[PDB]
Design an enzyme around this catalytic site. Sequence first.
Site, PDB file in Angstrom:
ATOM      1  N   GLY A 173       0.760  -1.224   0.000  1.00  0.00           N
ATOM      2  CA  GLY A 173       0.000   0.000   0.000  1.00  0.00           C
ATOM      3  C   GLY A 173       0.794   1.279   0.000  1.00  0.00           C
ATOM      4  N   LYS A 180       3.791   3.838  -1.865  1.00  0.00           N
ATOM      5  CA  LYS A 180       4.114   4.302  -3.204  1.00  0.00           C
ATOM      6  C   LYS A 180       5.625   4.381  -3.420  1.00  0.00           C
ATOM      7  CE  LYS A 180      -0.189   6.809  -3.942  1.00  0.00           C
ATOM      8  NZ  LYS A 180      -0.766   6.141  -2.739  1.00  0.00           N
ATOM      9  N   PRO A 218       8.804   5.654  -5.942  1.00  0.00           N
ATOM     10  CA  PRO A 218       9.170   6.460  -7.119  1.00  0.00           C
ATOM     11  C   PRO A 218       9.731   5.612  -8.241  1.00  0.00           C
ATOM     12  CG  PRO A 218      10.015   7.437  -5.121  1.00  0.00           C
ATOM     13  CD  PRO A 218       9.621   6.011  -4.778  1.00  0.00           C
ATOM     14  N   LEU A 222      11.669   6.328 -10.700  1.00  0.00           N
ATOM     15  CA  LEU A 222      13.080   6.595 -11.016  1.00  0.00           C
ATOM     16  C   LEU A 222      13.889   6.633  -9.718  1.00  0.00           C
ATOM     17  CD1 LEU A 222      15.231   7.164 -13.201  1.00  0.00           C
ATOM     18  CD2 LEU A 222      14.297   9.438 -13.413  1.00  0.00           C
ATOM     19  N   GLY A 223      14.987   5.869  -9.694  1.00  0.00           N
ATOM     20  CA  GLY A 223      15.874   5.885  -8.548  1.00  0.00           C
ATOM     21  C   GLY A 223      17.327   6.015  -9.004  1.00  0.00           C
ATOM     22  N   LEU A 224      18.220   6.392  -8.117  1.00  0.00           N
ATOM     23  CA  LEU A 224      19.655   6.431  -8.359  1.00  0.00           C
ATOM     24  C   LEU A 224      20.312   5.114  -7.988  1.00  0.00           C
ATOM     25  CD1 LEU A 224      22.099   8.338  -9.178  1.00  0.00           C
ATOM     26  CD2 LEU A 224      22.425   8.687  -6.739  1.00  0.00           C
ATOM     27  N   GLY A 225      21.006   4.485  -8.922  1.00  0.00           N
ATOM     28  CA  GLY A 225      21.783   3.295  -8.641  1.00  0.00           C
ATOM     29  C   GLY A 225      23.127   3.626  -7.993  1.00  0.00           C
ATOM     30  N   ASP A 269      18.838   3.261  -4.708  1.00  0.00           N
ATOM     31  CA  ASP A 269      19.069   1.827  -4.698  1.00  0.00           C
ATOM     32  C   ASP A 269      20.455   1.533  -4.141  1.00  0.00           C
ATOM     33  OD1 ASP A 269      18.124  -0.976  -5.588  1.00  0.00           O
ATOM     34  OD2 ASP A 269      20.192  -0.826  -6.297  1.00  0.00           O
ATOM     35  N   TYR A 285      27.826  -3.433  -2.113  1.00  0.00           N
ATOM     36  CA  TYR A 285      28.374  -2.322  -2.900  1.00  0.00           C
ATOM     37  C   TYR A 285      29.445  -1.593  -2.116  1.00  0.00           C
ATOM     38  CZ  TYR A 285      24.208  -3.076  -5.806  1.00  0.00           C
ATOM     39  OH  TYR A 285      23.182  -3.583  -6.576  1.00  0.00           O
ATOM     40  N   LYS A 288      19.557  -4.409   0.101  1.00  0.00           N
ATOM     41  CA  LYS A 288      19.488  -5.811  -0.301  1.00  0.00           C
ATOM     42  C   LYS A 288      20.307  -6.662   0.671  1.00  0.00           C
ATOM     43  CE  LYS A 288      19.430  -4.034  -5.033  1.00  0.00           C
ATOM     44  NZ  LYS A 288      20.584  -3.088  -4.955  1.00  0.00           N
ATOM     45  N   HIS A 322      18.884 -10.252  -2.311  1.00  0.00           N
ATOM     46  CA  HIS A 322      19.644  -9.722  -3.454  1.00  0.00           C
ATOM     47  C   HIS A 322      19.745 -10.694  -4.610  1.00  0.00           C
ATOM     48  CE1 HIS A 322      23.179  -6.731  -4.171  1.00  0.00           C
ATOM     49  NE2 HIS A 322      22.649  -7.091  -5.322  1.00  0.00           N
TER      50      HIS A 322
HETATM   51  N1  LIG Z   1      19.845  -6.379  -7.831  1.00  0.00           N
HETATM   52  C1  LIG Z   1      20.983  -6.620  -8.444  1.00  0.00           C
HETATM   53  O1  LIG Z   1      21.558  -7.694  -8.586  1.00  0.00           O
HETATM   54  C2  LIG Z   1      21.621  -5.479  -9.245  1.00  0.00           C
HETATM   55  C3  LIG Z   1      22.615  -5.828 -10.220  1.00  0.00           C
HETATM   56  C4  LIG Z   1      23.204  -4.769 -10.974  1.00  0.00           C
HETATM   57  C5  LIG Z   1      22.824  -3.431 -10.755  1.00  0.00           C
HETATM   58  N2  LIG Z   1      21.845  -3.191  -9.763  1.00  0.00           N
HETATM   59  C6  LIG Z   1      21.452  -1.770  -9.411  1.00  0.00           C
HETATM   60  O2  LIG Z   1      21.189  -1.149 -10.700  1.00  0.00           O
HETATM   61  C7  LIG Z   1      21.931   0.112 -10.804  1.00  0.00           C
HETATM   62  C8  LIG Z   1      22.174   0.482 -12.270  1.00  0.00           C
HETATM   63  O3  LIG Z   1      22.864  -0.631 -12.925  1.00  0.00           O
HETATM   64  P1  LIG Z   1      24.413  -0.520 -13.298  1.00  0.00           P
HETATM   65  O4  LIG Z   1      25.159   0.227 -12.254  1.00  0.00           O
HETATM   66  O5  LIG Z   1      24.838  -1.938 -13.552  1.00  0.00           O
HETATM   67  O6  LIG Z   1      24.545   0.289 -14.667  1.00  0.00           O
HETATM   68  P2  LIG Z   1      23.751   1.390 -15.510  1.00  0.00           P
HETATM   69  O7  LIG Z   1      22.999   2.285 -14.639  1.00  0.00           O
HETATM   70  O8  LIG Z   1      23.160   0.670 -16.646  1.00  0.00           O
HETATM   71  O9  LIG Z   1      25.038   2.170 -16.094  1.00  0.00           O
HETATM   72  C9  LIG Z   1      25.858   2.929 -15.220  1.00  0.00           C
HETATM   73  C10 LIG Z   1      27.042   3.363 -16.147  1.00  0.00           C
HETATM   74  O10 LIG Z   1      26.475   4.311 -17.113  1.00  0.00           O
HETATM   75  C11 LIG Z   1      27.080   5.562 -17.081  1.00  0.00           C
HETATM   76  N3  LIG Z   1      26.062   6.541 -17.278  1.00  0.00           N
HETATM   77  C12 LIG Z   1      25.060   6.990 -16.439  1.00  0.00           C
HETATM   78  N4  LIG Z   1      24.306   7.936 -16.917  1.00  0.00           N
HETATM   79  C13 LIG Z   1      24.847   8.133 -18.175  1.00  0.00           C
HETATM   80  C14 LIG Z   1      24.416   9.058 -19.135  1.00  0.00           C
HETATM   81  N5  LIG Z   1      23.389   9.918 -19.025  1.00  0.00           N
HETATM   82  N6  LIG Z   1      25.156   9.033 -20.307  1.00  0.00           N
HETATM   83  C15 LIG Z   1      26.213   8.175 -20.502  1.00  0.00           C
HETATM   84  N7  LIG Z   1      26.636   7.268 -19.560  1.00  0.00           N
HETATM   85  C16 LIG Z   1      25.908   7.282 -18.382  1.00  0.00           C
HETATM   86  C17 LIG Z   1      27.724   5.627 -15.691  1.00  0.00           C
HETATM   87  O11 LIG Z   1      28.868   6.503 -15.701  1.00  0.00           O
HETATM   88  P3  LIG Z   1      29.184   7.540 -14.457  1.00  0.00           P
HETATM   89  O12 LIG Z   1      28.748   6.895 -13.201  1.00  0.00           O
HETATM   90  O13 LIG Z   1      30.694   7.757 -14.611  1.00  0.00           O
HETATM   91  O14 LIG Z   1      28.417   8.824 -14.875  1.00  0.00           O
HETATM   92  C18 LIG Z   1      28.164   4.167 -15.415  1.00  0.00           C
HETATM   93  O15 LIG Z   1      29.387   3.781 -16.045  1.00  0.00           O
HETATM   94  C19 LIG Z   1      23.183  -0.261  -9.958  1.00  0.00           C
HETATM   95  O16 LIG Z   1      24.072   0.744  -9.683  1.00  0.00           O
HETATM   96  C20 LIG Z   1      22.557  -0.980  -8.768  1.00  0.00           C
HETATM   97  O17 LIG Z   1      22.002   0.060  -7.915  1.00  0.00           O
HETATM   98  C21 LIG Z   1      21.232  -4.185  -9.005  1.00  0.00           C
HETATM   99  O1  LIG Z   2      24.814  -7.964  -7.264  1.00  0.00           O
HETATM  100  C1  LIG Z   2      24.740  -6.856  -7.838  1.00  0.00           C
HETATM  101  O2  LIG Z   2      23.977  -5.981  -7.393  1.00  0.00           O
HETATM  102  C2  LIG Z   2      25.776  -6.498  -8.851  1.00  0.00           C
HETATM  103  C3  LIG Z   2      26.899  -7.503  -8.903  1.00  0.00           C
HETATM  104  N1  LIG Z   2      26.789  -8.423  -9.815  1.00  0.00           N
HETATM  105  N2  LIG Z   2      27.852  -9.301  -9.922  1.00  0.00           N
HETATM  106  C4  LIG Z   2      27.670 -10.308 -10.977  1.00  0.00           C
HETATM  107  C5  LIG Z   2      26.886 -11.429 -10.150  1.00  0.00           C
HETATM  108  N3  LIG Z   2      26.264 -12.470 -10.644  1.00  0.00           N
HETATM  109  C6  LIG Z   2      25.661 -13.294  -9.690  1.00  0.00           C
HETATM  110  C7  LIG Z   2      24.939 -14.461  -9.921  1.00  0.00           C
HETATM  111  C8  LIG Z   2      24.431 -15.102  -8.807  1.00  0.00           C
HETATM  112  C9  LIG Z   2      23.635 -16.352  -9.043  1.00  0.00           C
HETATM  113  F1  LIG Z   2      22.468 -16.173  -8.375  1.00  0.00           F
HETATM  114  F2  LIG Z   2      23.182 -16.410 -10.284  1.00  0.00           F
HETATM  115  F3  LIG Z   2      24.087 -17.489  -8.651  1.00  0.00           F
HETATM  116  C10 LIG Z   2      24.587 -14.679  -7.500  1.00  0.00           C
HETATM  117  C11 LIG Z   2      25.299 -13.532  -7.266  1.00  0.00           C
HETATM  118  C12 LIG Z   2      25.825 -12.864  -8.387  1.00  0.00           C
HETATM  119  S1  LIG Z   2      26.749 -11.404  -8.380  1.00  0.00           S
HETATM  120  C13 LIG Z   2      29.012  -9.300  -9.195  1.00  0.00           C
HETATM  121  O3  LIG Z   2      29.915 -10.113  -9.304  1.00  0.00           O
HETATM  122  C14 LIG Z   2      29.091  -8.292  -8.164  1.00  0.00           C
HETATM  123  C15 LIG Z   2      30.249  -8.288  -7.376  1.00  0.00           C
HETATM  124  C16 LIG Z   2      30.357  -7.319  -6.400  1.00  0.00           C
HETATM  125  C17 LIG Z   2      29.317  -6.423  -6.271  1.00  0.00           C
HETATM  126  C18 LIG Z   2      28.172  -6.410  -7.021  1.00  0.00           C
HETATM  127  C19 LIG Z   2      28.037  -7.393  -8.025  1.00  0.00           C
END
Ligand SMILES: NC(=O)c1ccc[n+]([C@@H]2O[C@H](COP(=O)([O-])OP(=O)(O)OC[C@H]3O[C@@H](n4cnc5c(N)ncnc54)[C@H](OP(=O)(O)O)[C@@H]3O)[C@@H](O)[C@H]2O)c1
Ligand SMILES: O=C(O)Cc1nn(Cc2nc3cc(C(F)(F)F)ccc3s2)c(=O)c2ccccc12
Length: 315
Positions: free
Chosen positions: A9, A11, A13, A15-18, A43, A48, A77, A110
Amino acid sequence: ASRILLNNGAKMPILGLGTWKSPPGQVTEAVKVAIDVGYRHIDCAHVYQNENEVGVAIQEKLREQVVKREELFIVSKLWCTYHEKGLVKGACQKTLSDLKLDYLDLYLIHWPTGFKPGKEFFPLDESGNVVPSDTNILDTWAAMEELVDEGLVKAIGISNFNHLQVEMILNKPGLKYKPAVNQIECHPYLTQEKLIQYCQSKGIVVTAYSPLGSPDRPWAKPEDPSLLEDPRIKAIAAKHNKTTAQVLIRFPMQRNLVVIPKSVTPERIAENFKVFDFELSSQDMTTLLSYNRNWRVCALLSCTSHKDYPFHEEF
Ligand SMILES: NC(=O)c1ccc[n+]([C@@H]2O[C@H](COP(=O)([O-])OP(=O)(O)OC[C@H]3O[C@@H](n4cnc5c(N)ncnc54)[C@H](OP(=O)(O)O)[C@@H]3O)[C@@H](O)[C@H]2O)c1
Ligand SMILES: O=C(O)Cc1nn(Cc2nc3cc(C(F)(F)F)ccc3s2)c(=O)c2ccccc12
């Protein structure tokens, strides 16, 4: 609209900052600039290694009364080495302490895979395979439900769960809270139609990660496809008088997804937020979907034999 309704329930946003790979010396300023220019969702993750510095930014903007806590949506996470029931509260509490928060708006499992507990985030055997923990998805989910009942988190979710793993939680005996979110990799090269329709059909909101194709991922290879340099996507940006990144951010928004582009560059942090003022056409959307090639930023080889590895799997 700037926010999407969750099944708890509250809300969220859209758009978030990674913050993965945001260097600890730069992510404080990055988060401050984000908040100043409109971001209300951050995020985060313990893995990280920068939550302390993220938290400094959050706390300074609360202190300055730029924003009130209620208006922020902070996500973190639970890392894979903390899947055991006895480790989950502590892992959450360390995250809260680092972020300078009393609660999280959303806490995610995560990855579906539990790894052996210890100081190491990726414990490996002598041959480089990850060392699993014998924990299962459903016991970890129960531990996350306890965090809600302790007021430490407002919502719980999952990340990198495939359709059958989501289905396993939805069917869990005695399930108390449904997942609010499934956060998964999603972009024109990994469009995820199947998994997204399943989750949304179940009222689970999908967050798209690596929306720009993670050009700063440490394992990038020159022959890898590049979203930001794809002439086809550049062409759609030019037609809208926007940048390629802005198209790649607006694309998940129109699929009713949450999206979390990462930057520590102030100019790009602001550019990335200026995506609420234009629309991709239905044809642009289908054209972008057509670029799917099942290409993944995140699928680490050392983990592919864990029993719960999520991507063997058609979806
Ligand atoms: N749940 C998970 O397993 C998981 C896994 C991966 C990622 N994530 C989350 O997702 C977020 C985003 O994914 P990501 O970090 O993999 O990559 P992304 O957001 O796809 O790309 C980030 C890259 O793009 C560049 N960038 C950003 N804005 C730009 C723009 N307007 N023009 C050109 N380049 C730009 C950044 O450079 P600069 O920073 O130098 O500007 C950085 O090198 C993460 O940071 C994390 O919070 C979660
Ligand atoms: O985790 C992030 O947010 C970014 C992320 N991705 N990955 C690639 C990965 N691939 C996976 C595959 C599995 C699997 F579930 F598939 F086994 C489990 C865990 C992972 S980590 C990384 O190796 C990593 C290392 C340090 C910090 C962040 C990350």
